[PDB]
Amino acid sequence: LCYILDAILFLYGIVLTLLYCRLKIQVRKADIAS
Amino acid sequence: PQLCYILDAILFLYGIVLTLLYCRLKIQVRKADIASR
Amino acid sequence: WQSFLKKELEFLGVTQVLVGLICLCFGTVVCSTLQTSDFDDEVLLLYRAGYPFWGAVLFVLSGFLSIMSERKNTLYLVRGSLGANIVSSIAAGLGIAILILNLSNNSAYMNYCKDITEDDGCFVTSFITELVLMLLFLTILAFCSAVLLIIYRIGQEF
Amino acid sequence: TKPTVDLLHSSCDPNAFHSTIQLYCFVYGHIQNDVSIHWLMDDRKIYETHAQNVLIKEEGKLASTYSRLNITQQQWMSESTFTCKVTSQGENYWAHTRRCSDDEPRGVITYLIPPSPLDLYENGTPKLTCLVLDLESEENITVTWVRERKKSIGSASQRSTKHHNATTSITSILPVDAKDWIEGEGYQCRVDHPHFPKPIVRSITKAPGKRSAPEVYVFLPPEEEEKDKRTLTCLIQNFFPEDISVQWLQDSKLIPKSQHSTTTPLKYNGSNQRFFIFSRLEVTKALWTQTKQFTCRVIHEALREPRKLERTISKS
Amino acid sequence: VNITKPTVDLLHSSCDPNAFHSTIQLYCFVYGHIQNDVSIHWLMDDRKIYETHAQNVLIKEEGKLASTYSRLNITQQQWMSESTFTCKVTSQGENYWAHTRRCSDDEPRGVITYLIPPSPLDLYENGTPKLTCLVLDLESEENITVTWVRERKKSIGSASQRSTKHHNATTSITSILPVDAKDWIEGEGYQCRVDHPHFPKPIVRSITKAPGKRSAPEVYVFLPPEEEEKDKRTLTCLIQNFFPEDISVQWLQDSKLIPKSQHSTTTPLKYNGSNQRFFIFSRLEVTKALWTQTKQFTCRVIHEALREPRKLERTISKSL
Amino acid sequence: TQKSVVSLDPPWIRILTGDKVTLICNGNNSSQMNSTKWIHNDSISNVKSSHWVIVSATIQDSGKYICQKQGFYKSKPVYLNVMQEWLLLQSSADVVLDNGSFDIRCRSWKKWKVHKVIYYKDDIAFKYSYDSNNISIRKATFNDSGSYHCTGYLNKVECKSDKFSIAVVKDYTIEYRWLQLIFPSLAVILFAVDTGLWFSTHKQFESILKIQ
Numbered sequence A: 001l002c003y004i005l006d007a008i009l010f011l012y013g014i015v016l017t018l019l020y021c022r023l024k025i026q027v028r029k030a031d032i033a034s
Numbered sequence B: 001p002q003l004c005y006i007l008d009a010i011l012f013l014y015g016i017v018l019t020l021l022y023c024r025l026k027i028q029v030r031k032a033d034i035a036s037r
Numbered sequence C: 001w002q003s004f005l006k007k008e009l010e011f012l013g014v015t016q017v018l019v020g021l022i023c024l025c026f027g028t029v030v031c032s033t034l035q036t037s038d039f040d041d042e043v044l045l046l047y048r049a050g051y052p053f054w055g056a057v058l059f060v061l062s063g064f065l066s067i068m069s070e071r072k073n074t075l076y077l078v079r080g081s082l083g084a085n086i087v088s089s090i091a092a093g094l095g096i097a098i099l100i101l102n103l104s105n106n107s108a109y110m111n112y113c114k115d116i117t118e119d120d121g122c123f124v125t126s127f128i129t130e131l132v133l134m135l136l137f138l139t140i141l142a143f144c145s146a147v148l149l150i151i152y153r154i155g156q157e158f
Numbered sequence D: 001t002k003p004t005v006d007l008l009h010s011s012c013d014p015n016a017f018h019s020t021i022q023l024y025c026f027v028y029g030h031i032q033n034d035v036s037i038h039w040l041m042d043d044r045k046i047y048e049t050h051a052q053n054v055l056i057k058e059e060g061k062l063a064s065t066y067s068r069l070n071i072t073q074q075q076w077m078s079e080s081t082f083t084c085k086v087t088s089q090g091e092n093y094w095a096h097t098r099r100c101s102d103d104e105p106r107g108v109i110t111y112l113i114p115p116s117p118l119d120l121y122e123n124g125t126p127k128l129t130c131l132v133l134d135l136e137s138e139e140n141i142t143v144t145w146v147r148e149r150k151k152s153i154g155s156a157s158q159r160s161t162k163h164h165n166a167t168t169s170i171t172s173i174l175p176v177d178a179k180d181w182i183e184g185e186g187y188q189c190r191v192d193h194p195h196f197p198k199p200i201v202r203s204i205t206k207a208p209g210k211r212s213a214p215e216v217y218v219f220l221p222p223e224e225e226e227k228d229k230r231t232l233t234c235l236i237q238n239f240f241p242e243d244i245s246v247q248w249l250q251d252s253k254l255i256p257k258s259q260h261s262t263t264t265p266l267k268y269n270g271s272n273q274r275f276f277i278f279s280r281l282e283v284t285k286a287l288w289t290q291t292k293q294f295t296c297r298v299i300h301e302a303l304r305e306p307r308k309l310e311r312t313i314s315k316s
Numbered sequence E: 001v002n003i004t005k006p007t008v009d010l011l012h013s014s015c016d017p018n019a020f021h022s023t024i025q026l027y028c029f030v031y032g033h034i035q036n037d038v039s040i041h042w043l044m045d046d047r048k049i050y051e052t053h054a055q056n057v058l059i060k061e062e063g064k065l066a067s068t069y070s071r072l073n074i075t076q077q078q079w080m081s082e083s084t085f086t087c088k089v090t091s092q093g094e095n096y097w098a099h100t101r102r103c104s105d106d107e108p109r110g111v112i113t114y115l116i117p118p119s120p121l122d123l124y125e126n127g128t129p130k131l132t133c134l135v136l137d138l139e140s141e142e143n144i145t146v147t148w149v150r151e152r153k154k155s156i157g158s159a160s161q162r163s164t165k166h167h168n169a170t171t172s173i174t175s176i177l178p179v180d181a182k183d184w185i186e187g188e189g190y191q192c193r194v195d196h197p198h199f200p201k202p203i204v205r206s207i208t209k210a211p212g213k214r215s216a217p218e219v220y221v222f223l224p225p226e227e228e229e230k231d232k233r234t235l236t237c238l239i240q241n242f243f244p245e246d247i248s249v250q251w252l253q254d255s256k257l258i259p260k261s262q263h264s265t266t267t268p269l270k271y272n273g274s275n276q277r278f279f280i281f282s283r284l285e286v287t288k289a290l291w292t293q294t295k296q297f298t299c300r301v302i303h304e305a306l307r308e309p310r311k312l313e314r315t316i317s318k319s320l
Numbered sequence F: 001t002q003k004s005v006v007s008l009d010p011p012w013i014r015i016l017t018g019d020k021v022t023l024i025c026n027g028n029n030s031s032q033m034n035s036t037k038w039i040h041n042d043s044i045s046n047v048k049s050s051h052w053v054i055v056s057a058t059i060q061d062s063g064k065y066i067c068q069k070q071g072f073y074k075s076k077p078v079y080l081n082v083m084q085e086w087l088l089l090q091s092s093a094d095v096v097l098d099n100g101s102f103d104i105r106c107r108s109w110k111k112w113k114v115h116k117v118i119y120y121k122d123d124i125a126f127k128y129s130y131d132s133n134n135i136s137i138r139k140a141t142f143n144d145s146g147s148y149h150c151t152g153y154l155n156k157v158e159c160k161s162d163k164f165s166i167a168v169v170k171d172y173t174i175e176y177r178w179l180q181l182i183f184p185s186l187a188v189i190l191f192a193v194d195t196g197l198w199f200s201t202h203k204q205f206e207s208i209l210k211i212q
């Protein structure tokens, strides 16, 4: 069953690329204003 | 059959891009910690 | 343009370590699981040359030396990491050539297979073809990283 | 005069290699100072006979002698016909021999079953059965029936059956007359097939010996038995031959044969052969106490007419 | 007195498809014997032929020497079974032999192994139960090993073996292993293995007691029948309703054992509709003089399912 | 050119000791001199001919065979089995495809020639023959899968053969399906590494946010 593994890994990629964007905008608003 | 075998390659590419992008934020955060100290 | 690369240096050291460890992990399963006496030596050319061992060792050593030279900045590890980077570039170019010949051998074998699931030969050749492709991508990326750090270290002394 | 010419031969000793088969033809009671013996194989002359005419005995004008032959094993196992030619008083006398043919060619087993005494001496419709077993298929198998005196034979009823072990069996039933079987008429069943080198020939006759009428004694249920069932026994003994039929009755009503058992006959005490059997009928308690009577009747060849003898058991 | 050896032949007639008698005549010729000092006995596969009534014919007499032959009648089915027929000639105490058999090929006759359980008389009365492994149809007794293994325990006793040479030029080997009773009631299994260097694998036969539901036999005895007043008297012993079929019946004439050749017992017959019950009949026929000597007969039965000490006797007396 | 094919000239895959078996490469009747590479039990043999002729088989001949002609690839491996029983049920294949064919035979050992043979499939008899011959099964379907054995008489002694399982499949099993389960098993390590890095990064940023 390859498709359920692809589904859970796609969900993992979605939540990790959401958390990366959250940390990226936090680093942006921290370092932009010194 | 062949579609899942193709999809493991883009899964590998996404994982590689993810760790290569997370390590840069890790070193930038650690450098902020060592600069604000 | 020199200030655009001093910030992005230890990531360039990290990606070589990652490429080398993935190379070693890819070589280990081929070393352990596969009974290599049942398959041709033309298909397994990347294993008979031993590339995922010395390429892994040189990439890990070059990345570790670049990381420690960044975090130490003493005047002994600098101008010694350049040799460990140029030998990694030589190993990466040799690996690119070896993987290209192995890809051509895989295409020559896979011409004579009506399906990917005919027997063990076509299936093992197809799996080794995916291994060759995502070793070639990482070898190109690590070669570019090593060459660009070599350029950065050369341009300082020039 | 008519001299008696019979041909006897030696055969395989299992304790010796025995590569020579030895043929003898005996001239019994021939006239004095006569006889010359020549040997033939496959209706052709043999001049390597080396015969030795040995005198046996002399009784007046009559005398006895024999001749002896020396043939190899391969000349005997070829199933050729050997005959000894006797020239006594100008007349010609013959005596042929061969090897006995294989009775199971291609592993085919054949049985010839005699008629039952119930069909023979009571029902009046006896039947002979030729059961042919262990066949690969039915096809190209012919079964033939041969009588002894008359060429007018009855119609056979041939049927086939495929078994659970993937083998085909053929059963042929020939209705015979009771009178001819009483006087001792022989019958033959010949099974033929193109792949058979020789046909299978089986013969049957009424069994020989000295006839003895059976003595039948019936026993009451045992006095220690006051349980839910009662057991009634019939003892039949001192009869030859082995063919017998036993029946049980319930106030002149026939009990089915699945409600009682009979034992295999056993030979007793010699030298003439006698047999005994036991017939057992077990009824329930309520069926026994219904003020009825039971009979035990047997049918045998050696009994007086009409070959039936009854023993009645009742509590009254 | 010197010993004169005669010459013994064994000749016979052949089959005839165009005949209906289906008999084969066997002739055993004896030449050069002494008068009134000859005797010819017939055998078939080491088993004596009692019920034939063979005819003995004298040929001639030459002074102190004579010639006789004996004739035997056998069926065609007995001849075609490839059995060996022997005539044994006895003269002045010595024995002379002659054998014959239907001619056949040199096909390698296979060997057969039989394993039989101990008798209930030795199991429950005598106390010495033995298992015997019988090996037949061997061309020679050399290089044959017969071993015994168990299932639960390991301590096997000494197994004495014996070899016999038969008239049909075959060798038989029988080995006897003495076992304990209580292991046989408790239900352990034994196994006999026969080996040879030319065998691909050893031939293995295993044995145990019969599995099922045990039922004690109810035995009954019958008086001689009321219609019998002849010179002989027949006594009956009906034994029924038992499982398994291993049983032992012996008669007793005034507390003295009667030999087993003086009475007969029928083969067990199954009944009761898949409830696995058996019945047998025991018959013993005595004369009127033995019956009228005020004896007291007894039918004794030993079965496994009986209560201890596993015996059952019924008494037949003419007074009661 | 293509992959080599190794075939048996007595094509029975189960034989007894002392039997003759000839191993053939890509296929012709020409025992060539030093042109074919043979591999037995994952080891290079000294037989370099195109025909590997075994005059008397032994228990040590029961392995795996791969032939490779000059200019060709290695072959699909074939398996030989040498046994020692009273009665052996031979076969030409143990796994056969749909619309395929295979033979069975009941064979005895060392001049103990068998007669009256009955062939069973899943303890159901379907064929009787007096002689021991081929039983050809053509147009193989799903119903031919089961356990096969035979009985027979050596001279007059009934003997039984061990059961042999023959399976009919729509496609061959290709014995290496777990090799493609590596890349998702690498992605579940890489994403775990990513989460372990994210937790430390967020902890360090939350500790430096309290400093400011």
Ligand SMILES: *[C@@H]1O[C@H](CO)[C@@H](O[C@@H]2O[C@H](CO)[C@@H](O[C@@H]3O[C@H](CO)[C@@H](O)[C@H](O)[C@@H]3O)[C@H](O)[C@H]2NC(C)=O)[C@H](O)[C@H]1NC(C)=O
Residues within 6 Å of the ligand: D109, D111, D113, D131, D133, D134, D163, D164, D165, D167, D169, F116
């Ligand atoms: C295949 O199975 C059939 C039956 O399912 C076997 O046929 C049976 O063979 C036995 C042995 O020959 C027959 O017993 C004989 O019967 C005659 C006539 O009553 C008797 O005179 C003999 O003394 C013997 O008891 C039996 O009748 C026969 N069954 C039928 C229905 O005909 C056959 O032998 C099996 N073949 C193989 C190769 O296993």
Ligand SMILES: *[C@@H]1O[C@H](CO)[C@@H](O[C@@H]2O[C@H](CO)[C@@H](O[C@@H]3O[C@H](CO)[C@@H](O)[C@H](O)[C@@H]3O)[C@H](O)[C@H]2NC(C)=O)[C@H](O)[C@H]1NC(C)=O
Residues within 6 Å of the ligand: E044, E045, E046, E047, E082, E083, E084, E109, E112, E114, E134, E136, E137, E166, E167, E168, E170, E172
């Ligand atoms: C050569 O002659 C000997 C002596 O008669 C033959 O041995 C006998 O063979 C029969 C058939 O196998 C044996 O009968 C069997 O007995 C066992 C034990 O009681 C029983 O369980 C079987 O059901 C069967 O009835 C018989 O015991 C045996 N006799 C002796 C003394 O061992 C032998 O078969 C002959 N060989 C040839 C090739 O004719």
Ligand SMILES: CC(C)CCC[C@@H](C)[C@H]1CC[C@H]2[C@@H]3CC=C4C[C@@H](OC(=O)CCC(=O)O)CC[C@]4(C)[C@H]3CC[C@]12C
Residues within 6 Å of the ligand: B019, B023, B026, B027, B030, C014, C017, C018, C021, C022, C025, F186, F189, F193, F200
């Ligand atoms: C063995 C196969 C199956 C996979 C191997 C991949 C990863 C387990 C490895 C390869 C390289 C490793 C990296 C090598 C170097 C670094 C830099 C390092 O940066 C620091 O020193 C930051 C300060 C701190 O350690 O907190 C953080 C971990 C990281 C990303 C490592 C995380 C784990 C990585 C990705």
Ligand SMILES: *[C@@H]1O[C@H](CO)[C@@H](O[C@@H]2O[C@H](CO)[C@@H](O)[C@H](O)[C@H]2NC(C)=O)[C@H](O)[C@H]1NC(C)=O
Residues within 6 Å of the ligand: F041, F059, F060, F061, F062, F063, F064, F081, F082
């Ligand atoms: C090749 O490998 C096979 C394993 O399949 C070997 O066969 C075994 O051999 C041993 C004795 O050497 C026997 O005890 C086994 O029963 C055999 N196994 C089977 C399945 O038959 C064979 O001997 C090997 N041959 C060589 C030359 O090494």
Ligand SMILES: *[C@@H]1O[C@H](CO)[C@@H](O)[C@H](O)[C@H]1NC(C)=O
Residues within 6 Å of the ligand: D020, D022, D049, D050, D069, D070, D071
């Ligand atoms: C034929 O063989 C027998 C037995 O071997 C022998 O006694 C006899 O003398 C032989 N016949 C001749 C004519 O030699």
Ligand SMILES: *[C@@H]1O[C@H](CO)[C@@H](O)[C@H](O)[C@H]1NC(C)=O
Residues within 6 Å of the ligand: E023, E052, E053, E054, E055, E072, E073
């Ligand atoms: C043997 O058979 C012959 C031929 O029928 C006969 O004359 C003879 O009386 C028979 N012998 C015995 C003892 O029955």
Ligand SMILES: *[C@@H]1O[C@H](CO)[C@@H](O)[C@H](O)[C@H]1NC(C)=O
Residues within 6 Å of the ligand: E142, E143, E197
């Ligand atoms: C029997 O055993 C001996 C040794 O005890 C052996 O030499 C011989 O080969 C064996 N076989 C035969 C047939 O004698």
Ligand SMILES: *[C@@H]1O[C@H](CO)[C@@H](O)[C@H](O)[C@H]1NC(C)=O
Residues within 6 Å of the ligand: F010, F011, F012, F092, F103, F134, F136
């Ligand atoms: C029997 O089978 C063998 C091996 O499978 C084969 O060589 C032979 O040609 C076959 N014979 C027939 C008549 O099918």
Ligand SMILES: *[C@@H]1O[C@H](CO)[C@@H](O)[C@H](O)[C@H]1NC(C)=O
Residues within 6 Å of the ligand: F141, F143
């Ligand atoms: C195969 O078996 C099934 C059930 O056992 C049956 O329905 C089907 O008809 C069989 N196939 C053939 C071709 O007989």
